[PDB]
């Protein structure tokens, strides 16, 4: 759901489109995520490990 579950009915949204919607808050545009998608995924995985 994302941030919506904490402010109303809990609406649904795919996770690869709920991180392209959080780069925008930082300042970097969203396209960067899709263009690095796979790479970023691996990094995140390694991070948790």
């Amino acid at each position: 759901s994302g941030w919506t579950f904490g402010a109303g009915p809990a609406l649904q949204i795919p996770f690869p489109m709920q991180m392209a919607y959080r780069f925008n808050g930082i300042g970097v545009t969203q396209n960067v995520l899709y263009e690095n998608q796979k790479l970023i995924a691996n990094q995140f995985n390694s991070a948790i490990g």
Binding site: P16, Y34, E35, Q37
Partner: protein, 35 residues
């Protein structure tokens, strides 16, 4: 490079805004060349 991108048409507004005038420009020229 992006996964899940879906085919469609994008209605770039600037073109029909021009094309609203580009449709009438070409027709006018041909009439004046007729004589």
């Amino acid at each position: 490079v992006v996964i899940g991108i879906v085919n469609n048409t994008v209605y770039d507004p600037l073109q029909p805004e021009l094309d609203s005038f580009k449709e009438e420009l070409d027709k006018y020229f041909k009439n004046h060349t007729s004589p």
